[PDB]
Amino acid sequence: SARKQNNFSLAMKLLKELHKESKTRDDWLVSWVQSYCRLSHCRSRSQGCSEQVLTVLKTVSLLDENNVSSYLSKNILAFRDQNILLGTTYRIIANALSSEPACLAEIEEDKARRIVIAGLYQRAFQHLSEAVQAAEEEAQPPSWSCGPAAGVIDAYMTLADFCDQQLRKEEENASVIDSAELQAYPALVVEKMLKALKLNSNEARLKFPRLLQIIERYPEETLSLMTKEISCWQFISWISHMVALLDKDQAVAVQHSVEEITDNYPQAIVYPFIISSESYSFKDTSTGHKNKEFVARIKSKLDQGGVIQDFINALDQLSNPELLFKDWSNDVRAELAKTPVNKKNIEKMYERMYAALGDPKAPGLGAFRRKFIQTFGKEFDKHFGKGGSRMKLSDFNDITNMLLLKMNKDSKPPGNLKECSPWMSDFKVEFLRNPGQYDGRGKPLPEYHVRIAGFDERVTVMASLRRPKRIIIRGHDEREHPFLVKGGEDLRQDQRVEQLFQVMNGILAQDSACSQRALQLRTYSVVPMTSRLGLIEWLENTVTLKDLLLNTMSQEEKAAYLSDPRAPPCEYKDWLTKMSGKHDVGAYMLMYKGANRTETVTSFRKRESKVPADLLKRAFVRMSTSPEAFLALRSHFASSHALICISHWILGIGDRHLNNFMVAMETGGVIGIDFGHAFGSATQFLPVPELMPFRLTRQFINLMLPMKETGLMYSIMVHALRAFRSDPGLLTNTMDVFVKEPSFDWKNFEQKMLKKGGSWIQEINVAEKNWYPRQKICYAKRKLAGANPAVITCDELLLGHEKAPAFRDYVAVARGSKDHNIRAQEPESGLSEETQVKCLMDQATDPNILGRTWEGWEPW
């Protein structure tokens, strides 16, 4: 139990006090696997772990043979011993081995081949990985010996994870002998898999569909074993991933999941219901028509008692008007350029809408009534009487901006309260429906389902871009539950975002340091629905901190705050127009001189951002009823804010404005809501050249007051990194599948755009046929995950487009600005553990990289 301690020297004296004591022979065995699980802990070193292995390997076979002939435990113990052979095989990247006479040859080849130059320099990887290949197969007898469950899983997994890193390492080179050994592993992926899983490590199933297309899939391994899956539950979390793939993905291989979906349709019918609708896609050709017709009957297997969905959809449509217009003027115009598509695709985009406008007095919408459209669709029955009856002309693409604008001046008058005349509110339950939300955890768990107990007629509009509309679901289990409305949003990437996010805080559990001081990161449950719509969960008493800044001005310092924003785009926009002629781009490539920039931000960010350093902590005295809980919630304020800069950086930014992650009034805590841009796009993309990793506003550290030394405390970011590196597979294997997979995520992010506006969306797809990375994201992404510092070297390397002016500034700012200020020159582009963070916080408040920036992005 001493080994629990995450410190090191302690387990050294204590091995000695159990190593001496001899009276039992089996005591000394546990002392071995103790000393070697100890060996495993120090293996988090760089060369130290290897050294420990070198020392333990000399004494691992030293007394192991002597102590006992065999044990169920000895065998498992043998498996553990084999485990350290992995610490041997790894690490040497063709480097110069330090001066180790006598010791190296003696154990490099002789201790590696059994159990010179012909086998090492080019082949030591094969010598060592075969000594452990033959050692791991000697962890197969736990499959034949019955026992108490626990030990088999520990090796089952670690067996497999040798082969994932085997296969992706194999995704770099190809030969004939590697392929014969590569034909010995991939059918061994399913065996370590399953084996009556009792503790879910779900990442493995997900990598596997990729394994069925990269080679000729294995029907039998997938047919036999996968029906014996429970040998409860587990049918869930893997929810959406399969249905997409089975219908069209993987051809015939994809079908093996139709025995999956129907070995999982019966139990928990409730969940895929909401998605499988969205997962229609399409079906093609001949041998799949036999199967397309099959799951089309699986569709007939779920429309029963599922006759309630159309009504729900009608209600959402009745609910919004502006979202439809913007999902209309952009989809209509310009997409009729190129080669004209008058096929079935462009005619249905009508039926989604132009049929939702020719039927408000017709049976299409006689079953799903609206009231705003009742007048509007009637005001729209007339204009569509002339605009719709078709056309098929291309010069009128530009003329549709006249009509849209006219109806925009007719769509802003309405949008009023109540809105219980659109019916959907007065939907109720008859004969017990002869409910929203779902549970996706592991384990059986029945009675979990909430039941909808009608709505409340009252509603709330909350103005923000798309103008969403808050909702309180009134519910069965004697409680309520509020929701929000985003019917234009493709809630799918943010879906996996939170999945990857409790992958995150699902690793913050297990580290002694992280757990010690209790440091988790709150997130919620988006619920996507049928691609064209979706809703979102809504906590209480949280708000945008921007309002904690407005109401703290008081009409006094608000007459001094009315113009406070005004101090940027008056005094800062003027300083643009002197840099170059006024416009939208900012002519930021012309923005030159590196000290002039530092002048206007050391001068104007001081004079301005000293007004809200007071105002901030002054919004922090109101929060405080008494002077003792103040040092708890300003405290938890950082407790949260540090877990996000570090976190979002790994994710690919948070890009969240002062209204895009919200603070909670009651207990601080900064759950972040914005998830539009991801990875490098927010800076890699040309339409908006914006660069900064996290956000650290000059008047933020100001809040902490005399927190100038370091920041976030050197505590936050070091517990942070440390938890991120210690287990690779998870965070790693999660993003790697998240990409390359969904068609929306890539090349269709050009389509995810036109969000703010549309002037950005053009000239992207034509200039971005070089945005097909997959292999240059993830590799350079995992070196990010903690394996590399660089930080600066990362961004320049990240952007492909020539940067005559922009690239120099980024390189100049990342290293040059701080390289005469040494925050960026001296940290190596090779490796450093926590150094990269010290500058990471640094390479943000540098007034040089704060100067040339975006307006409204709250850059202070």
Side-chain angles (χ1 to χ4, degrees), residues 1-4 6-24 26-31 33-44 46-48 50-51 53-62 64 66 69-70 78 81 83-103 105-113 116-136 138-143 145-191 193-194 196-197 200-202 204 206-216 218-222 224-231 233-246 251-253 255-268 270 272-281 285-288 291 294-296 298-308 310 312-314 319 321 324-325 327-342 345-348 350 354-356 358 360 362-367 369 371-375 377-378 380-381 383-389 394-395 397-408 410-423 425-427 429 435-436 440 442 444 446-448 450-509 512-515 518-529 532-540 542-552 554 559-577 581 584-587 590 594-604 606 608-616 618-655 657-661 663-664 666-673 675-689 691 693 695-697 699-704 706 710-712 715 719-721 723-739 741-745 748-751 753-791 793-795 797-801 804-806 809 811-814 816 824 826-840 842-848 850-851 853-854 856-857 859-860:
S1 276
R3 174 218 285 172
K4 152 155 222 179
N6 199 251
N7 188 315
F8 283 95
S9 295
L10 272 39
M12 288 178 165
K13 55 207 274 174
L14 260 282
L15 168 71
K16 304 170 180 173
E17 310 313 318
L18 196 61
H19 173 232
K20 172 185 66 58
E21 206 196 63
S22 324
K23 105 164 196 165
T24 38
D26 299 308
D27 154 46
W28 267 354
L29 278 98
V30 190
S31 178
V33 317
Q34 169 67 12
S35 177
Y36 298 155
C37 180
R38 214 302 300 260
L39 181 273
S40 65
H41 292 349
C42 183
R43 286 193 270 175
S44 304
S46 63
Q47 184 56 195
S50 59
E51 313 311 352
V53 179
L54 178 55
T55 299
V56 302
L57 191 278
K58 282 166 184 168
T59 55
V60 67
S61 82
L62 176 58
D64 185 356
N66 181 21
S69 60
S70 61
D81 181 352
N83 286 8
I84 304 192
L85 287 171
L86 82 84
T88 63
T89 305
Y90 189 40
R91 292 186 164 255
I92 311 199
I93 318 154
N95 308 327
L97 317 183
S98 283
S99 64
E100 307 162 356
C103 302
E106 270 188 356
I107 311 179
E108 260 66 85
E109 206 205 4
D110 293 335
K111 300 212 183 201
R113 290 181 69 176
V116 290
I117 54 183
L120 291 185
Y121 155 69
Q122 261 292 325
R123 285 89 46 178
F125 268 99
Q126 203 174 359
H127 272 348
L128 298 153
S129 57
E130 192 273 309
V132 72
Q133 172 186 1
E136 294 151 1
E138 217 177 3
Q140 101 189 10
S143 63
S145 61
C146 179
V152 300
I153 178 180
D154 283 48
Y156 263 139
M157 293 251 164
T158 326
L159 185 268
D161 270 27
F162 171 61
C163 325
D164 195 317
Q165 320 305 343
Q166 158 90 347
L167 261 283
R168 199 174 326 178
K169 197 179 181 184
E170 269 274 349
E171 257 196 4
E172 222 52 32
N173 62 317
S175 300
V176 51
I177 60 173
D178 302 359
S179 89
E181 282 168 353
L182 181 60
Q183 283 174 55
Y185 290 104
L188 300 185
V189 308
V190 303
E191 61 187 10
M193 191 177 36
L194 304 335
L197 306 169
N200 46 22
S201 307
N202 311 2
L206 291 123
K207 175 75 133 170
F208 279 86
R210 178 183 305 261
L211 298 174
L212 285 193
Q213 317 139 352
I214 218 179
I215 318 159
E216 187 169 12
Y218 295 117
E220 291 176 41
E221 323 301 354
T222 68
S224 202
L225 187 33
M226 302 187 167
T227 326
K228 262 173 209 162
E229 61 171 29
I230 307 309
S231 56
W233 228 243
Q234 266 197 215
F235 321 111
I236 293 264
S237 182
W238 61 52
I239 286 298
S240 308
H241 320 77
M242 324 261 291
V243 47
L245 312 66
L246 187 56
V252 296
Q255 288 289 9
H256 268 302
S257 314
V258 80
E259 294 299 317
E260 270 298 328
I261 190 173
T262 326
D263 278 324
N264 302 248
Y265 174 86
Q267 287 299 349
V270 56
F273 278 164
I274 295 208
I275 49 144
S276 178
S277 210
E278 171 250 2
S279 301
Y280 66 109
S281 57
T285 55
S286 56
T287 41
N291 322 124
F294 180 88
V295 200
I298 302 290
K299 182 175 201 314
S300 186
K301 280 176 205 179
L302 48 91
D303 296 303
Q304 181 191 56
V307 293
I308 309 70
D310 297 0
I312 310 301
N313 179 5
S319 67
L324 315 176
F325 309 115
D327 285 343
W328 170 83
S329 46
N330 296 141
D331 287 352
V332 166
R333 187 172 39 78
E335 258 150 43
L336 277 157
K338 318 161 165 178
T339 63
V341 183
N342 306 329
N345 283 5
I346 298 314
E347 194 70 32
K348 177 176 184 175
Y350 271 53
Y354 184 76
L365 299 195
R369 293 303 287 196
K371 216 285 159 188
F372 284 75
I373 289 299
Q374 185 77 13
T375 51
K378 264 175 197 169
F380 293 164
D381 277 1
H383 302 82
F384 300 162
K386 200 277 312 304
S389 294
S394 62
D395 71 317
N397 257 340
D398 323 318
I399 311 181
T400 201
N401 284 19
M402 164 200 49
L403 181 74
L404 172 66
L405 274 165
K406 193 159 123 181
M407 319 338 282
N408 296 339
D410 312 339
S411 64
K412 36 176 181 60
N416 298 336
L417 241 183
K418 205 100 169 45
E419 297 191 323
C420 305
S421 54
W423 160 68
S425 66
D426 313 323
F427 171 95
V429 305
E447 310 294 13
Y448 76 119
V450 66
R451 293 182 183 174
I452 179 187
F455 315 90
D456 174 34
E457 253 184 347
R458 176 193 184 187
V459 86
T460 287
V461 174
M462 179 206 128
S464 294
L465 268 68
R466 296 304 90 200
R467 313 291 152 172
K469 197 175 313 161
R470 176 162 54 77
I471 279 195
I472 298 264
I473 306 195
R474 294 220 140 260
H476 172 17
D477 200 60
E478 294 78 15
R479 289 169 198 284
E480 67 280 356
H481 197 342
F483 272 72
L484 251 62
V485 171
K486 266 175 176 175
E489 221 305 311
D490 191 340
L491 291 214
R492 281 195 62 206
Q493 68 299 353
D494 44 6
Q495 226 200 334
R496 252 74 74 203
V497 152
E498 156 64 341
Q499 272 197 7
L500 279 62
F501 253 111
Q502 54 182 27
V503 163
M504 300 266 273
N505 61 37
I507 282 155
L508 306 188
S512 60
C514 175
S515 175
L519 321 162
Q520 193 103 302
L521 213 44
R522 215 180 188 268
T523 325
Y524 32 65
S525 57
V526 278
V527 195
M529 297 140 149
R532 287 301 201 96
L533 62 104
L535 270 46
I536 180 186
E537 205 192 7
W538 183 239
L539 174 57
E540 179 43 63
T542 182
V543 281
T544 83
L545 51 153
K546 167 151 203 167
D547 218 355
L548 278 171
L549 275 171
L550 292 162
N551 62 9
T552 204
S554 182
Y561 194 85
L562 178 293
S563 302
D564 170 13
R566 170 120 56 79
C570 262
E571 317 176 358
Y572 163 77
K573 246 174 193 174
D574 186 5
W575 181 53
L576 311 188
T577 60
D584 176 20
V585 168
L590 198 51
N596 299 348
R597 281 185 180 170
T598 54
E599 173 262 329
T600 52
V601 169
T602 43
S603 91
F604 293 110
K606 267 168 228 162
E608 280 83 85
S609 93
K610 287 176 190 178
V611 190
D614 306 10
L615 286 146
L616 202 165
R618 197 166 66 179
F620 263 71
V621 77
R622 321 182 180 291
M623 93 166 201
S624 304
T625 302
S626 301
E628 283 306 337
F630 174 69
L631 280 173
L633 228 48
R634 167 157 93 83
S635 273
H636 219 298
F637 177 73
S639 305
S640 43
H641 180 71
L643 273 58
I644 77 163
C645 309
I646 308 271
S647 306
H648 271 282
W649 184 94
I650 308 179
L651 308 175
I653 219 182
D655 203 357
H657 311 85
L658 81 167
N659 69 340
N660 280 269
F661 42 66
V663 280
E666 282 281 22
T667 170
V670 192
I671 48 95
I673 208 181
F675 301 104
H677 277 216
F679 291 24
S681 303
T683 178
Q684 177 171 13
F685 275 41
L686 209 283
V688 46
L691 68 94
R695 194 131 31 261
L696 194 130
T697 286
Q699 57 85 43
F700 188 107
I701 171 173
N702 270 130
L703 154 67
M704 317 167 184
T710 300
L712 307 154
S715 69
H719 294 305
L721 160 86
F724 263 110
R725 288 166 156 173
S726 266
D727 51 327
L730 297 86
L731 192 183
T732 296
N733 286 5
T734 43
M735 321 216 58
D736 194 9
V737 53
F738 168 54
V739 317
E741 186 102 19
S743 306
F744 171 94
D745 206 10
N748 292 19
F749 176 73
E750 291 89 319
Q751 284 59 35
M753 213 190 191
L754 60 91
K755 194 129 152 168
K756 289 189 179 308
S759 53
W760 295 259
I761 198 184
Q762 58 181 355
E763 287 274 18
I764 299 187
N765 293 92
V766 186
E768 285 198 355
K769 281 309 112 191
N770 34 27
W771 185 69
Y772 282 47
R774 192 205 64 200
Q775 77 257 15
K776 202 199 159 186
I777 275 188
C778 182
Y779 259 84
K781 224 182 151 303
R782 191 161 62 233
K783 69 188 200 169
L784 270 42
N788 263 127
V791 175
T793 306
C794 155
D795 315 14
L797 174 57
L798 171 58
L799 62 80
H801 320 269
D809 304 358
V811 300
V813 178
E826 181 163 15
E828 317 289 344
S829 56
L831 187 61
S832 35
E833 40 275 0
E834 96 301 335
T835 287
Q836 47 179 333
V837 198
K838 200 51 55 203
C839 34
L840 214 77
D842 199 322
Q843 285 282 33
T845 166
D846 213 281
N848 199 313
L850 255 178
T853 40
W854 194 225
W857 181 85
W860 311 119

